[PDB]
Design a protein around this ligand. Structure first.
Ligand SMILES: [Zn+2]
Ligand SMILES: [Zn+2]
Ligand SMILES: [Zn+2]
Ligand SMILES: [Zn+2]
Ligand SMILES: [Zn+2]
Ligand SMILES: [Zn+2]
Ligand SMILES: [Zn+2]
Lengths: 358, 162, 165, 347, 71, 71
């Protein structure tokens, strides 16, 4: 407990905030360290890495490990766990000759741009460049020579546009979509019935369940979702093999729309409170003289539905109330004082953090 | 009057699958056909909340500045809207990108037999389509009026930066 | 007060990319839409220090008297100018020409003494500096007649290119 | 040394300056060459001297009747007269296609070719191959094989590039004055320029890391953007969203800071006017004008504050200026820094 | 390393060799006549350049000229 | 001596401590919540290993994870 406090000091000394560089080169040479330490040379590296990780307020985009008298990466292999987004690295003046060790760092340091292995024996190997380009996907410069064109590399690993949470053709549609969305959702949460004035006899509404589980790497994804209450009403043409049901699952008229509305769980949408958790798109729909409003977000499940297997069914897990992520699309037709929903298409899916988040 | 038909549903679903297949196809030759699906006079395209007025620019950007993709259809629902002469499709699907570092031509960013693509982790996609009912009559020329493509969730470990 | 926003920046970048993509489009039909981006009443266009009075004429020249091209954005910076209601963008990019010997129609210059279209062979890269004066309305996702200023000039040329300026 | 003077003599005798033609046809007939005794190794030497002499500019070459079975002996021609327009290889024994393959994408400006009495003329693939090998070939065996009009229109832009464009000559004078004064002040004393910036006026720098193709004359294949990378505002390269916001400098103070962050430089505008290109246009929305200047500058001194190697650079600088009758104020200043490369407007 | 000498005509070979070995501080061990110009080999390049410095020297009513196989 | 417990969620701390005190017949005397994982101190190392034996046990809809914190 006492010992760690010193090492904290050494690191702070070796870190520069302006250049964002941590100089961990030549630890054997630092006089402060020799009096205090060395036969324990192996246990200091990972400890220092952990201590580097635990202490916030130091952000490193560059690390120097030149001349640490390492034959193998092992002692510092843990670096990948500490600064995974490291951009520059120098390992010069070291005795590393084999490739076996570096295999620990495959698919790690994905944002590494520069690498310096100038005086290390590996520089002799013919497969050196190839293997290094294999090991560090975004590497641009290797031993001070350019090995990848930043232009192409940038174009390849990025889409033409950075994602945005909102798109509106004109500001009017923006204000209108916002108003409609907030109001509709508040009503959808608290009293489903009131919404029925927005649907005509021709208006249609259906729900589609996406049973798909997002990748675990996705931040805050729900790896065990529960679509108990929804599965009965799901109108997913790809998933539901029953062709006869799909005809029935579509709800037309305020009556059937209300029935399905009662069939769905009671919810709460924090659009006003947590605006960053929602993305919306609105576009013109000339064929109906209207607009299309698509809303991607999440909602909390407060109450069981107002309305309501062969071998084994359990109400506890499958019907557990939990927040869900959703994609809802309203095809709306404007009138002077009022609006009518031509179509309402909902998608219910396991909760997952928005791709629009930054 | 409102249309509810299983046949039309099959047409719709399969057409969606065809569109995603068209998206995933890197072959530059077939691209020419892809543009045929979109209405040249009036079309509304959206990609990650970034608009596209005409399909050509969008598809050029897709062909050039986006790597080869692999779509996996997770969900589809559609509403045929009477009087509109059109139908709206709410689609949800998963996507994998070729994170080999090679574009559709197979050209590397490295300074100096067909290669296999290295698929990255899955991305979440929500796609809204406005199509003409004419597809029920085997007509696919300029049927796509609305194309709203947006990502709903992303994997952190992906090398692709949206 | 000065406008500085990342959203606006991304909008600018992607729009610029869209402009270059629009240039790269060889199909003559859609040309009419490209003209929509330029202000019909008052517009200032320059190409290699040679001016063009109207966007129509410039794009006609581009469509008729220039081979198929491929642009690649290398750099872009912008300043939104308060009170002007406009922003200016300093752009730098690379260019490739279709040096097949075929025009946009795909007609060869070979004199004949004898549905799948052939692929273009891309020549060496050209260096371009493009200055854009645009209306701020693009930040409100409005692109109709937004381009008032368009200054396109070559900064360096590769000698081995078959294209002669 | 002995042979070269003689061969030089033969070349000089066989070269005609007015027609710009080098007649190396029928060397075996030349009594001067037979007088010595000469044989295969002679051509490349003659080529080396042809390059070395530089007092001969050749647009046409005659190599008729040199008893050549293959181009190998004269291949070096491609290295000596790459801009050759006319070539004659008639009355020679060339029969296979292998030899000419060295010359693909070479002699790009070759217009006429005569392979009369050469066996290759019999082959069906002859025309195709000749057309492939020489992109701008117009005449082959005295028959037209390519339309000059179309060929010209395709491989050239509608307008010849120009070094200067000014709406009005007055704007020309004013823009030149502004450029020279601003740049001289920019070179020698950075602080004074602050007199030209208002509190709202903004300035930022964008680094273009792109390396020109090696084929570009006098291009810097190994650029060094050490000092600039810290202040660079390149929205395309830098994905970091906050930095781009930070990179922008408003007001004379921050503008001064970045002015101090950049290396001390020197622009030889007055000394070398041909190394710079400028465009000036009206800016009605601000009742001012825009000056875009493309050129180069030398890096004399390291920045006054705190890869990092000093090197000559090429630049694109754009000033949006609003005139005030006493003095002028820069609404905006947009600089782009890139690796050195000769102007495309150069001849 | 192959040495050629011209404009030695009207004078003898041995005298020329000795003359060169006198003035140029370099010796050629085996020298071949070969018609108008003398051919010889010198052991090292330093002697060849040193030998090449004595170019245009007056000898037997004319000025010698020295040359090497590959420029 | 220092004990950390994870995957105790869905049940109260009291249930966890009593569960351990029932099954493993070893008690942590002062147990602190400290966010997601429960911290406590046990008297001896023998009790710590014995307690560590009960690692893959099912508890409140999840499987406990036990650790001896060096920190
Ligand atoms: Zn040491
Ligand atoms: Zn180093
Ligand atoms: Zn467009
Ligand atoms: Zn003859
Ligand atoms: Zn002739
Ligand atoms: Zn100078
Ligand atoms: Zn505690």
């Amino acid at each position: 407990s006492d010992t760690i406090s010193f090492l904290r000091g050494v690191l702070l000394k070796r870190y520069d905030p302006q250049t964002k560089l941590l100089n961990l080169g030549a630890l054997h040479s630092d006089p402060e360290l020799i009096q205090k330490g060395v036969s324990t040379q192996s246990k200091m590296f990972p400890a220092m890495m952990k201590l580097a990780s635990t202490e916030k307020s130091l952000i490193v985009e560059s690390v120097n490990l030149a001349d640490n008298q390492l034959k193998d990466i092992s002692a510092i292999s843990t670096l990948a766990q500490t600064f995974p987004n490291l951009k520059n690295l120098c390992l010069a003046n070291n005795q590393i000759f084999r490739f076996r060790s570096l295999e620990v760092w495959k698919n790690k340091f994905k944002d590494l741009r520069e690498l310096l292995m100038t005086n290390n024996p590996i520089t002799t190997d013919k497969l050196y460049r190839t293997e290094m380009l294999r090991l560090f996907p975004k590497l641009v410069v290797l031993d001070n020579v350019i090995v990848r064109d930043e232009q192409k590399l940038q174009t390849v690993y990025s889409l033409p546009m950075k994602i945005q949470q909102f798109f509106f053709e004109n500001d009017a549609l923006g204000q209108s979509s916002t108003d409609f969305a907030t109001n509709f959702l508040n009503l959808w949460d608290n009293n489903r019935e009131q919404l029925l004035n927005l649907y005509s006899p021709q208006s249609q509404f259906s729900v589609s369940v996406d049973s798909t589980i997002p990748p675990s790497t996705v931040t805050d994804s729900d790896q065990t979702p529960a679509f108990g209450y929804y599965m009965s009403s799901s109108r997913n043409i790809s998933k539901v093999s029953s062709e006869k049901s799909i005809q029935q699952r579509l709800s037309i008229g305020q009556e059937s729309i209300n029935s399905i509305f009662k069939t769905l769980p009671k919810t709460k949408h924090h659009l006003q409170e947590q605006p960053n958790e929602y993305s919306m798109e609105t576009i013109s729909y000339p064929q109906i003289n209207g607009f299309v409003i698509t809303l991607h977000g999440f909602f909390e499940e407060t109450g069981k539905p107002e309305l309501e297997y062969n071998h084994g069914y359990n109400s506890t897990s499958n019907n557990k109330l939990s927040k869900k992520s959703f994609d809802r699309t309203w095809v709306i037709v404007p009138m002077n004082n009022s609006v009518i929903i031509a179509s309402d298409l909902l998608t219910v899916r396991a909760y997952s953090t928005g791709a629009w988040k930054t | 009057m409102v249309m509810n038909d299983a046949n039309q549903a099959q047409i719709t679903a399969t057409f969606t699958k065809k569109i995603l297949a068209h998206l995933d196809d890197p072959d530059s030759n077939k691209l020419a056909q892809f543009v045929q699906l979109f209405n040249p006079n009036n079309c509304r395209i959206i990609f990650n909340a970034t608009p596209f007025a005409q399909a050509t620019v969008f598809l050029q950007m897709w062909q050039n500045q986006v790597v080869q993709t692999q779509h996996a259809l997770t969900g589809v629902d559609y509403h045929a809207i009477p009087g509109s002469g059109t139908l709206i499709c709410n689609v949800n699907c998963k996507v994998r990108f070729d994170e080999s570092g090679r574009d559709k031509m197979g050209q590397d960013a490295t300074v100096p037999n067909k290669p296999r693509p290295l698929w990255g982790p899955y991305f979440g996609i929500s796609l809204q389509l406005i199509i003409d009912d004419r597809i029920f009559r085997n007509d696919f020329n300029g049927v796509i009026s609305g194309f709203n493509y947006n990502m709903v969730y992303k994997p952190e470990d992906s090398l692709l930066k949206i």
